[PDB]
Amino acid sequence: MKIDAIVGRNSAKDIRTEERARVQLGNVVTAAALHGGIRISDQTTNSVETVVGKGESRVLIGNEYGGKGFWDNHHHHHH
Amino acid sequence: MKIDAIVGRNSAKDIRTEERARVQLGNVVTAAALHGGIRISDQTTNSVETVVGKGESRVLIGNEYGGKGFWDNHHHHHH
Amino acid sequence: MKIDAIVGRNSAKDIRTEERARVQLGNVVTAAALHGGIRISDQTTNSVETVVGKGESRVLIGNEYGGKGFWDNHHHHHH
């Protein structure tokens, strides 16, 4: 009670990634989407229990700003 | 911000993504949708139990702002 | 109001990475998204209990700015 800071949590209980699975847990901010300023300091709270990815799965648990950070179509993957 | 507690949670119980599936669990904000939205403490509350994606599925569990973040349409065919 | 302690934690309880799996725990800042801060652009709080990746898996637990740090963009069948 009585807060002036950031509020809005995303939570996960269990995560299982198997086989060619990539998971981003937390936050991804693309440059274009948001860079400082008097931006948001309040976000929607999401909470998941168990999440499993099987077979080339891409899973992002958290907040993606922009929509080019974790997911994409086809780029120059050189590593 | 100074709003005491944000109300509006999304909750997921079980998630299974199988086979080339992509899942966004959380909140996606496109740039266009929210830059200087410095106060959002009353949103929609959605709870789901089990969600399964099978075979090249896109699934977003959470909030999508802009409608362009996770479900980025075919914008880059040149890639 | 008067803050020195930032509110916005990414927490993890247990992590298991096996077989060519790589995990980034903390924060990954690429130069492009922001260099050395510039406000708190993002400090969204995420909390996960147990996360397991098995089999050449990529798991990032925390915040990725830029999307060029721990991973880069890939070649996936269907966007």
From Swiss-Prot, chains A, B, C:
Record region (Prion domain (PrD)): 2-73
Subcellular location(s) of the protein: Cytoplasm
Summary of the function given for this chain in its UniProt record: Responsible for heterokaryon incompatibility, a process that ensures that during spontaneous, vegetative cell fusion only compatible cells from the same colony survive (non-self-recognition). Forms a prion for the non-Mendelian trait [het-s]. Interacts with het-S from incompatible cells to trigger a lethal reaction that prevents the formation of viable heterokaryons. It is unknown if the native, soluble protein has a cellular function.
Note: [Het-s] is the prion form of het-s. [Het-s] is the result of a conformational change of the cellular het-s protein that becomes self-propagating and infectious. This conformational change generates a form of het-S that assembles into amyloid fibrils. [Het-s] is transmitted as a non-Mendelian cytoplasmic element. On vegetative cell fusion with neutral [Het-s*] strains, the prion spreads throughout the cellular network and converts the non-prion form of het-s to a prion state, making the strains acquire the [het-s] phenotype. Interacts with het-S to trigger incompatibility.
Domain notes: The globular domain is dispensable for prion formation and incompatibility function. However, the het-S globular domain, but not the het-s globular domain, is essential for programmed cell death.
Subunit and partners: Homodimer. Forms heterodimers with het-S.
Stated name of the protein: Heterokaryon incompatibility protein s
Gene: het-s
Full protein segment contained here: 218 to 289 of 289
